[PDB]
């Protein structure tokens, strides 16, 4: 496939303010979304059908993430806390307290006994899921932390910040193992490891995505054409069909690139405001996208390749 052919299948309405993130459950059955309206919503991944609302945060939510067994969620909120949720019961199992300002990003490790978080307070924290206690506080950055992610075996954490740095941390010790710098350091608005753990994908507010070989500290690929000068927009590796990079954009489109050739292969039209978040289904050729306040909807897209 020189190109995918994603086409719109469902539009999901219900959030009453900007959506902030969307994530597919690892078992592929569900989509979770978080919003400035202080709510988490659960939707069917294949039919787009609204399932349930999960409530409890006192202010808007910036991010949500799934545990590996698809049974728990963690959410990051402007109320300076994270909450761990039992999805089936809707119960808040733990409230993770410690950050001194807005919490912007969160993720489980693969084993899902740990949670990592990043905050406006410029720190990265590592939490024990079962006790809800903070294990480590990392003096990670000198500006707000925009993303945090574990690698494939959980031994590394990558963090990014508006200070222009991506850093790699040892989970066990909390030591800073690496700082990634290019020829220039625009604010970094998103970062994550590749599925095989060998690479890092970073978004910067100069309208650019970069693929880094972090063990060698070198920038390999570069993806442009989209618009990103303001917001924390998620980006993804799509690997179920052809190998693509997928991202939202401030011109209201979903951008899809050939991972290898860096060429734009598709631009998905339909949203009426900034596409702040995209997610890729774990086993099927399905993308979810979500948009900001003037739109408020989530869209599900499907390709034959
Ligand atoms: F060589 C490329 F193009 F840089 C590259 C980058 C990432 C991956 C990959 N596979 N799985 N996860 N990441 C494969 C190839």
Q: Transcribe 169-185 into DSSP letters.
A: EETTT--EEEEE--SS-
d(CA 243, CA 34): 27
Nearest to 205 by CA among 163, 263, 177: 163
Concatenated DSSP letters of 20-50: EEEEE-TTSSEEEEEETTS-EEEEETTT--E
Q: Is the dihedral of CA 214, 219, 224, 230 positive or negative?
A: positive
151 CA distance to ligand 1 middle (Å):
14
* Alpha carbon 185 to chain centroid, angstroms: 21
d(CA 100, CA 105): 14
The pair of structure tokens assigned to 117 is 């978080």
d(CA 199, CA 83): 30
Q: What is the DSSP letter of 102?
A: -
Let me know: does 296 contact 19? Beta carbons within 8 Å: yes
Q: What is the CATH number of domain 1-305?
A: 2.130.10.10
Atom of ligand 1 nearest to the CA of 195: 12
d(CA 61, CA 74): 11
Token pair 């303010």: residue:
17
* Dihedral Cα 28, 82, 252, 234, nearest 10 deg: -70
Angstrom resolution of this structure: 1.7
For a substitution probing ligand 1, which of 192, 194, 240 has the most ligand atoms within 8 Å of its CB?
Answer: 194
Q: What is the DSSP letter of 8?
A: E
Give nearest CA residue, ligand 1 atom 10.
196
Q: Which residues pair with 151 in a beta bridge?
A: none
Give nearest CA residue, ligand 1 atom 13.
194
Give nearest CA residue, ligand 1 atom 3.
260
The pair of structure tokens assigned to 11 is 């539009």
Pocket of ligand 1 (CB under 6 A): 194-196, 199, 211, 220-221, 237, 259-260
């Amino acid at each position: 496939p020189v190109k995918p052919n994603y086409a719109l299948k469902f539009t999901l309405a219900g959030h009453t303010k900007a959506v902030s993130s969307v994530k597919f459950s690892p078992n592929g059955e569900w989509l979770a979304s978080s919003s400035a309206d202080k709510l988490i919503k659960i939707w069917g991944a294949y039919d787009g059908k609204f399932e349930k609302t999960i409530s409890g945060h006192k202010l808007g939510i910036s991010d949500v993430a799934w545990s590996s067994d698809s049974n728990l969620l963690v959410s990051a909120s402007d109320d300076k806390t994270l909450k761990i949720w039992d999805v089936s019961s809707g119960k808040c199992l733990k409230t993770l307290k410690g950050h001194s300002n807005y919490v912007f990003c969160c993720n489980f490790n693969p084993q899902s006994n740990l949670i990592v978080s990043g905050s406006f307070d410029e720190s990265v924290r590592i939490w024990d899921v079962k006790t809800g206690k903070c294990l480590k506080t990392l003096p990670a950055h000198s500006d707000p932390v925009s993303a945090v992610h574990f690698n494939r075996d959980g031994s590394l954490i990558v963090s990014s910040s508006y200070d222009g740095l991506c850093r790699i941390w040892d989970t066990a010790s909390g030591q800073c193992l690496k700082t990634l710098i290019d020829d220039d350091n625009p604010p970094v608005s998103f970062v994550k490891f590749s599925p095989n753990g060998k690479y890092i994908l970073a978004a910067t507010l100069d309208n650019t995505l970069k693929l880094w070989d972090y063990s060698k500290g070198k920038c390999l690929k570069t993806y442009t054409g989209h618009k990103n000068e303001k917001y924390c927009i998620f980006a993804n590796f799509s690997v179920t069909g052809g190998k693509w990079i997928v991202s939202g954009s401030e011109d209201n489109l979903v951008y899809i690139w050939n991972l290898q050739t860096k060429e734009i292969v598709q631009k998905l039209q339909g949203h009426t405001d900034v596409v702040i978040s995209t997610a890729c289904h774990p086993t099927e050729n399905i993308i979810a996208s979500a948009a900001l306040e003037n739109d408020k909807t989530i869209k599900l897209w499907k390709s034959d390749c």
